[PDB]
Design a protein around this ligand. Structure first.
Ligand SMILES: Cc1ccnc2c1NC(=O)c1cccnc1N2C1CC1
Lengths: 507, 402
């Protein structure tokens, strides 16, 4: 019937030789009825004492741990899964359950001898068998089956370029844009194509109907969403509850715009046990309530229409927080999202926004096979200035400035040349200015930034600063506007305050 | 009838992740692979094959078509060494044209048992479908085994031109053929075109548009010092710092007299007329930097490393060495956008690396993986793929170059 896939054991390894655990006469009974029905259907066949391999059977379950450890590797079952926002709308979508998946697919003739197992006798031998098909629980079954499935489908597919089929382990999602009756016709046409291969499917009235809850999503043929999340109404929250809450809040962000978890997240600081109860902060309940609210109103993701453009829009939600949404028709979201990723202890919004663009870009190629046109709250001048002067290579695709505050800008800029008539501070924790002044006021690296801070404090609106620290130099030259370190942030505060600042390094 | 090839003792085949592609590139790749299959060059494969190499589709120069690039890097490292040496005359030639002789390989079957290792996958948008899988039946373009295994057949079809025109130096590296000469740029393009038919007529587009490298005109970017009217305290500080660095290379450099014009905590902008001692010390230092340090030699047994620096305004600086501070070469590259330039840089620099030493370098790129992974294939046109890693360029090193 269906082509056989050549299997082999890993190199320099012999088949399994594991002893059958002792069995109940009651259990021996049942296995023999089960293994007799199976030999009549060809799935297995009695073998002689020629075969020295054996796998454990219990009550019918065959333990293939050993054989699996010894079987070769196969190509990756379901590398990744599609994201609902990358689907094209359908009038009808039918899910086809496939029972006896493995049992209708033949096993490499030269491999069967390794699938041998034994049914113990009740009276002081026990029957010996081997598989002629793909055994449930075997390493390669899932793959050999996906692959096989694919082959069977190909035809049907070439004769119905309209229908779209997605294979998901044992399910089969079949959509189209056929008039209601027509769709059902094709579906039943498919069901037979699978029958001509001993593959069985559910009858129209036994089939699950839209929406389909999939991997945390709720799917219709025309619009999508994630399966309804309910926010608890406790008065006592455990570290665990908060983790799960944040977890779920998170998952929703891909479609529910406005979800925030910062305040809830802050609750895990210093916790000492998963069962520790943390009381909610004023800001934390305000956040929960806001979410609980946003959630109350269901929102539906819309599917992809390839004849139209992909628009990506990004907004700054807070310090280090970004939100974006991708759509084709205004506010008609295919998908939304957040980005909090801080790469490096220090950064500026310009760098961060760029990283957001990149994540979004990557994601898009994966979901739609192309990049979106971006709408960004930064002007080309601002962008260009930073790009033009940053040591790292970077690139941002087609983007259009959007006047949607907050706009990202550079809070400060280091003079490219020393300043005339601006005092000069020499720092190494203390300074010595050229005008006589001085102050000799922690990790090595943190003592360095301390100096610089001092100098900034005591200086006027213009300053020239010389330091030997290549570190601080690096830091400040990258013109961060936000930092994990408090010191820095104070320095940054200073920086923004000045009129002109020139920093220089000396050995 | 096929020659047996093997993986280095104990080694298994490649299982490299395929980087996500654009619908554009994927459609091209399907168009392509479907016709390579019809010609029995590749064959689809099953679950029993777990190996994988990444494929990409790049553009050809003045071709309407796309080229299929298979990143055989991981495989190449696991392929047995084969037992052609490099002509140091090639780098002296005036004009070197580069041809793509990759298609020659598609006429030689590949040892049935090795095939499974050439597996690659053609992804599908959003994981909506399984993903088309193939393995090569012939020698694939890009794999180190292919030139080696075709060497013989190659030398033969090239012994006539090589003796009927021994003024021409010919070097082959993977899918590429480097044709050198001293002829006039006009005499070149003609002798070149004849070789094309003498290959066609003896059963080939050229690379880098239809152009000539001019290796004879490749020089080292010596370290330079600011030459200027008056010197401020800043200028000098910048000067000493730069000098101090360069002294680890050229130990003859002295800063004593310069550091002296710097005693006292002076205003940065204060102009400092230079003394006689200072001025002549700078002169010496300047004289020293006029040429590459002596002693540096190319070791064939070591890796050729190449770091690039972003300078700005479409300007980059790079260096090729094997041992830190001991550069074998230094250059500059200027004109787009950052990425495009960095890629044209990398490629330009690999070619020379190939022409000069016949081996590609290991690059250190100032860019995030994801950004690079995303755009490189857009402007890439070479048939090979060097190795590379990603770094964080120190603001002081950029400063010390150009
Ligand atoms: C779970 C899943 C994965 C991939 N595609 C789909 C589905 N399921 C659907 O319900 C669906 C909905 C709308 C459009 N395509 C869909 N289908 C396509 C197959 C008809």
């Amino acid at each position: 019937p269906i082509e056989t896939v050549p299997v082999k054991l890993k190199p320099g390894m012999d088949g399994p030789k594991v002893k059958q655990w002792p069995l109940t006469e009651e259990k021996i009974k049942a296995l023999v009825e089960i293994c007799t029905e199976m030999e009549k259907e060809g799935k297995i066949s009695k073998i002689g004492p020629e075969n020295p391999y054996n796998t454990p059977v219990f009550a019918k379950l065959v333990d293939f741990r050993e054989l699996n450890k010894r079987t070769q590797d196969f190509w990756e079952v379901q590398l990744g899964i599609p994201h609902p926002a990358g689907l094209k709308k359908k009038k009808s979508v039918t899910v086809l359950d496939v029972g006896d998946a493995y049992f209708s697919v033949p096993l490499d003739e030269d491999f069967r001898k390794y699938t041998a197992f034994t049914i113990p006798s009740i009276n002081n031998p026990g029957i010996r068998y081997q598989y002629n098909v793909l055994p449930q629980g075997w390493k390669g079954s899932p793959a050999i089956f996906q692959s096989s499935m694919t082959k069977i489908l190909e035809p049907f597919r070439k004769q119905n370029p309209d229908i779209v089929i997605y294979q998901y382990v044992d399910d089969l999602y079949v959509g189209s844009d056929l008039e209601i009756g027509q769709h059902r016709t094709k579906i039943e046409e498919l069901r037979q194509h699978l029958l001509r291969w001993g593959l069985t499917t559910p009858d129209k009235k036994h089939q699950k109907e839209p929406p389909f809850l999939w991997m945390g999503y709720e799917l219709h043929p025309d619009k999508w969403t994630v399966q309804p999340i309910v926010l608890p109404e406790k008065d006592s929250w455990t570290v665990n509850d908060i983790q799960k809450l944040v977890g779920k809040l998170n998952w929703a962000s891909q479609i529910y715009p406005g979800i925030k978890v910062r305040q809830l997240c802050k609750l895990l600081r210093g916790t000492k046990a998963l069962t520790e109860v943390i009381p909610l902060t004023e800001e934390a309940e305000l956040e929960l309530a806001e979410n609980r609210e946003i959630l109350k109103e269901p929102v539906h993701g819309v599917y992809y229409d390839p004849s139209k453009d992909l628009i990506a829009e990004i907004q700054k939600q807070g310090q280090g927080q970004w939100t974006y949404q991708i759509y084709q028709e205004p506010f008609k979201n295919l998908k939304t999202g957040k980005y909090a990723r801080m790469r490096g202890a220090h950064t500026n919004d310009v760098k961060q926004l760029t990283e957001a663009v990149q994540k979004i870009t990557t994601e898009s190629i994966v979901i739609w096979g192309k990049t979106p046109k971006f709408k960004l709250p930064i002007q080309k001048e601002t962008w260009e200035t930073w790009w033009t002067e940053y040591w790292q290579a970077t690139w941002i695709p087609e983007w259009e400035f959007v006047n949607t505050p907050p706009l990202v800008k550079l809070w400060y800029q280091l003079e490219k040349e020393p300043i005339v008539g601006a005092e000069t501070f020499y720092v190494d924790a203390g300074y010595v200015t050229n005008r006589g002044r001085q102050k000799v006021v922690t990790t090595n690296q943190k003592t360095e930034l301390q100096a610089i801070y001092l100098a900034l404090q005591d200086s006027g609106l213009e300053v020239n600063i010389v330091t030997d620290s290549q570190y601080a130099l690096g830091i400040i030259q990258a013109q961060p506007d936000q930092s994990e370190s408090e010191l820095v942030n104070q320095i940054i505060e200073q920086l923004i305050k000045k009129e002109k600042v020139y920093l220089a390094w000396v050995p | 009838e096929t020659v047996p090839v093997k993986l280095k003792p104990g080694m298994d085949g490649p299982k490299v992740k395929q980087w996500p592609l654009t619908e554009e590139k994927i459609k091209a790749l399907v168009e392509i692979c479907t016709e390579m299959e019809k010609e029995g060059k590749i064959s689809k494969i099953g679950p029993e094959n777990p190996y994988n190499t990444p494929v990409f589709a790049i553009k050809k120069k003045d071709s309407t078509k796309w080229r299929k690039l298979v990143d055989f890097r991981e495989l190449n490292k696991r392929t047995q060494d084969f037992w052609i040496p490099h002509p140091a005359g090639l780098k002296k030639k005036k004009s070197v044209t580069v041809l793509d002789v990759g298609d020659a390989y598609f006429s030689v079957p590949l040892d049935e048992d090795f095939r499974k290792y050439t597996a690659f996958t053609i992804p599908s948008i959003n994981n909506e479908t399984p993903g088309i899988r193939y393995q090569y039946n012939v020698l694939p373009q890009g794999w180190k085994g292919s030139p080696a295994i075709f060497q013989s057949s190659m030398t033969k079809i090239l012994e006539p031109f090589r003796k009927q025109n021994p003024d021409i130096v010919i070097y082959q590296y993977v899918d590429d053929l480097y044709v050198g000469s001293d002829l006039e740029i006009g005499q070149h393009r003609t002798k070149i075109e004849e070789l094309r038919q003498h290959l066609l007529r003896w059963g080939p587009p050229f690379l880098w548009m239809g152009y000539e490298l001019h290796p004879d005109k490749w020089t080292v970017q010596p370290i330079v010092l600011p030459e200027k009217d008056s010197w401020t305290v800043n200028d000098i500080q910048k000067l000493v710092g730069k000098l101090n660095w360069a002294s680890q290379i050229y130990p003859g450099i002295k800063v004593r007299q310069l550091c002296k014009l710097l005693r006292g905590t002076k205003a940065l902008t204060e102009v400092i007329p230079l003394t006689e001692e200072a001025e002549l010390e700078l002169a010496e230092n300047r004289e020293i930097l006029k040429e590459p340090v002596h002693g540096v030699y190319y070791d064939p047994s070591k890796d050729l490393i190449a770091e690039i620096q972003k300078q700005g305004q479409g300007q980059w600086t790079y260096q090729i060495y094997q041992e830190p501070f001991k550069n074998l070469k230094t250059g500059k590259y200027a004109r787009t956008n950052d990425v495009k330039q960095l890629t044209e840089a990398v490629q330009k620099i690999t070619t020379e690396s190939i022409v000069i030493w016949g081996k590609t370098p290991k690059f250190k790129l100032p860019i995030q993986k994801e950004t690079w992974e995303t755009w490189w294939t857009e402007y890439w046109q070479a048939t090979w793929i060097p190795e590379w890693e990603f770094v964080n360029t120190p603001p002081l090193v950029k400063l010390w170059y150009q």
